[PDB]
Amino acid sequence: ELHRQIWQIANDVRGSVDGWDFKQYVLGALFYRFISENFSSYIEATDDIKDDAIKTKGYFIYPSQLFCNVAAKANTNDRLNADLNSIFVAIESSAYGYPSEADIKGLFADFDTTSNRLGNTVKDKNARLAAVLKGVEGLKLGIDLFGDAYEFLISNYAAEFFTPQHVSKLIAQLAMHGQTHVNKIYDPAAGSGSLLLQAKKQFDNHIIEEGFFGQEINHTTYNLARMNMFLHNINYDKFDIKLGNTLTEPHFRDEKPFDAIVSNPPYSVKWIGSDDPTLINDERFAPAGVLAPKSKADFAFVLHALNYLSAKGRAAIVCFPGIFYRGGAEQKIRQYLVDNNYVETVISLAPNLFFGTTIAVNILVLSKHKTDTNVQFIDASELFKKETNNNILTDAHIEQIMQVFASKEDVAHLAKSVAFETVVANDYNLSVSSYVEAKDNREIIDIAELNAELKTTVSKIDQLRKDIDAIV
Amino acid sequence: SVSSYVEAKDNREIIDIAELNAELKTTVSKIDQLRKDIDAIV
Amino acid sequence: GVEVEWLPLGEITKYEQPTKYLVKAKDYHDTYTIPVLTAGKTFILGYTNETHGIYQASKAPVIIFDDFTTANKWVDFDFKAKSSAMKMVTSCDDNKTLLKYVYYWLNTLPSEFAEGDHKRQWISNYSQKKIPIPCPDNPEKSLAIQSEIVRILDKFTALTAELTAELNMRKKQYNYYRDQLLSFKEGEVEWKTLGEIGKWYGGGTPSKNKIEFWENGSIPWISPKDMGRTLVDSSEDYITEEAVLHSSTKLIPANSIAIVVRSSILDKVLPSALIKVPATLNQDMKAVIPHENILVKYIYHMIGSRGSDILRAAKKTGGSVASIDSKKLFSFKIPVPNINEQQRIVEILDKFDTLTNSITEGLPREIELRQKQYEYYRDLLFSF
Amino acid sequence: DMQVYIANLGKYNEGELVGAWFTFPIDFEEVKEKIGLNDEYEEYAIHDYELPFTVDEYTSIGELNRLWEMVSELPEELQSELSALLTHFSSIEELSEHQEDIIIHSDCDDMYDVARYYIEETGALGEVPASLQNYIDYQAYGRDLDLSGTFISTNHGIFEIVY
């Protein structure tokens, strides 16, 4: 109802062009809006929405450490947005240098790659700034996901991974259990880490320890995902995200052997080996024996995931369901995963419950916290896989999924644990057990027989009188 | 252009073929029904 | 029925793939001979059998449709192609198998074999194991005692095929007979223009956010997906009796008829049902009550009878989901006789299509009961 | 086509460089009369090859004829695209396991054609109404098959490694 209003504003600001350049508008304006809320509220103690040279950067170096900027003492959202026909042109690419560089300290570069100083026209440009940032200046509350429009501007084509929040809630409540520990938290191959937002801004007063060292390919996606959490007070003083490819650069390799991680491995994650560098003889693919091929290198990531692992803290990943064990090219891989219980449990899901897949995935939960027994504790449905307007708090199931994941709850029409030797007795079910007993009816011979007999005997005289009436 | 839109794919057939097929398949059905009644072995 | 063993599936089976088919043609006209049999039904029409390597010659193999479905089963009856997904199944040992036996024996387990869900090939599943086989009565008396029941079940499958056949024959015959007879009526029957017989209605759309006016009550809310049936007194949806405060609908008596104006016509014949309770409906469709000059069954079947032409009457009125107007749905002269002449001929008409059509006292219902008893007796039988 | 420059380990620095090209089948005594000997037996210095695959620097000549017989065993369109097919696999007997499991598409040339083939002419869904005729997202269907199926884009067509 309020998000209906915010939703309609999100619809209408899309007129008349898409959020590739409106990325810059929304992020810069909402960023300095957050500054004029928070940073200026630090220096309210009642004076200025129209902020002026009252910052005292000698003493305002503390948010230049903590908010990692003195952004614009003289170049505010009020001190840049007034008129038509001024001097000069250039206010959106280069020379807001003192917040963009901001080397002292904890700088986290490529921080302000949206709008600094240039610049195309005189005040078509700067009056575009004036009028549009003034029409955005008054977009009031009507604050946790106050960039819901930004959660829809990144979802503009999404109405490939753009964080389905029900799946994200499922991973975060399935990060449970065995979680009040250190560190909190690691994420490899993150992307749009708002799954980390409902994983930690939900757990903010619960436990908050360490930075979220995601790693994605697309640099604009990287930067928007970095500032995305920071939009709604998730601190980026030191809690940050690294850039690169995750196998050529699995930094930090030293810090540390992690305990609790999550991820969504996407597609477009394949790579060619096998291996030409010394990743042929690395710490993770020499335990694999055979190595990740040119296309199905998704299976490298779990090999990466055990590389960053401890026994107590458990790790939730997902893969699209091209894993039964994928032949002898991956069997020993699977066998390595059932050399011990390196993999602990698996969970299936329902198609779609995503953005247009329409396939399920396979959740793989990995800890070296063994019983030992093979786990097939899966449930396809339900998992009411329609939309996000029914069963919105719980799915009536996240407590039930939580209980099955808790301790070995072996409920029919749902799969249960099998023997550790059963998966090597069988040819590595993933997952065929159990899929119990749908649509098996049985009726009475007399009831199905006499009723048919009666309705036929109706039909015979109907046929005869029809032939009577078939006469002209 | 509702005018004219003239009347494609209109077909009709003759009575006697249909009704003779009708009566012969009913006889086949009836002998199969009494045969099924024989097959009703409990 | 003593010496019965499970046997592996691909044991006696010569399973194979289709060979190099060049079936990628553009026209398959009936002057050509061999069926280009694909998934779904077992018949797209003829093709040239000469110099295309079509197999066609064992007079009883079977197949598996589909890749990713594994449920569509057909006996390769006479002389058939290898059209593009026909993964071929016959036997190695042709002394025991009698594979209409195993054509049945697939669907003896529909609970693990005949369920097509995702994009997965199932070579191990149909290849390996198992099937209860009366081996070691192999081959001699096993095929003999199973020949008894396979004669019975082939007559039951024949029953299914012929009842569908005579259903189609009866429907086609009677639909010819509807308008061969009962047309051109003389004389002289009044050429009453449409809708003038009684004040037909429009409907009215509620608010679905009115939770009181959407869940409770017992007025059957009628949708065009509730339509397509015949004589729907009450629909599936049970909208509120107080919903008439905020629905703008029309209250109907027990002798109303319904009509749609969206989403399926402009292409086909219009659905119609006899609505018989006080029920309500939106602007997606309309309703007719007649008035006193009539018979409401005669009005109903005057709609259904002239359906092939009252589709044409107000035909396009937009190429959208939006379809046939009210205008020339009000503006066509139909023969409407006097009240002494409706009841006899519409009684014969009602009598015939309540012989044929849905559901109880209906041939397809009978077909479905025989389908149920067929599958039940197959379960009953191969419990040896 | 498929010929090797193999001689000799005697004068290891490619001294006594003899023996130009050897098409298959290749014999010990044939190459031995081609080269003489290096006073002992240290020969078949693999240094150059016209082969459609990857061979090793010390592969014995019987193994070379074995590889060639496996090549000649395979159909020629697969012999043309051994380089692409061996990317998924690792050896040839491995390829000879699933040599029945290759779907060939000269007819289909991109993923769009694969989707249109498996939908339209295969009839994987049956009804194509004229109201629904355009309205089959071949692009997303090809994306989903690319997620599921192992596909290889080649010159002569598209090869689907189905299991």
Coordinates of C-alpha atoms in Angstrom, one line a residue, chain A residues 2-3 5-6 33 37 138-144 146:
Chain A
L2 CA 2.9 2.3 0.7
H3 CA 5.1 0.0 -1.4
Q5 CA 3.0 4.1 -4.0
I6 CA 6.8 3.5 -4.0
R33 CA 20.6 11.7 0.0
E37 CA 20.5 12.2 6.1
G138 CA 11.4 15.3 -2.8
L139 CA 10.9 11.6 -3.2
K140 CA 10.2 11.2 0.5
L141 CA 9.4 8.1 2.6
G142 CA 5.7 8.3 1.9
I143 CA 13.8 2.6 4.9
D144 CA 15.3 -0.9 5.1
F146 CA 14.2 2.1 0.5

